[PDB]
Ligand binder design. Sequence first.
Ligand code: HEM
Ligand SMILES: [K+]
Length: 123
Amino acid sequence: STLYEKLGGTTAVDLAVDKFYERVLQDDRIKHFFADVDMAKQRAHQKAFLTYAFGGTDKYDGRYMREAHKELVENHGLNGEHFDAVAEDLLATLKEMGVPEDLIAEVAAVAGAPAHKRDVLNQ
Ligand code: HEM
Ligand SMILES: [K+]
């Protein structure tokens, strides 16, 4: 199954989520998409994204993805350049964790997959 077991338990998951959260928070390309939400919810998001990318797709229905990002698309100007910045932040986090470049490619293909990018971007 999912995230806890793929990364190797509680501490490892928290490490991945915190590093990802940190990088995105400091990323001027995209930090503003989180301006109207609290810090706890910003981290919860990076956790969700990470879970998805590692293969916990199940709980993130495309229709829910479309709706969940609709205000970003309509109100914050969310586009593909932004989507890519977040994907790239995740992969940079996993590299900074020593995760193998092949295995980063595996999640890179998931997180950045056309049907999901299409849903997030309200294409
Ligand atoms: C792997 C791709 C992604 C998945 C699976 C995903 C999933 C989610 C989910 C499940 C929520 C809902 C949180 C909630 O309802 O409590 C959410 C919210 C959000 N996502 Fe994503 N997301 C993805 C990519 C992105 C990207 C690329 C951005 C760009 C910044 C983004 C920005 C946001 C924002 C701003 C919210 C709303 C925060 C809030 O109001 O709670 N997401 N996303
Ligand atoms: K543990």
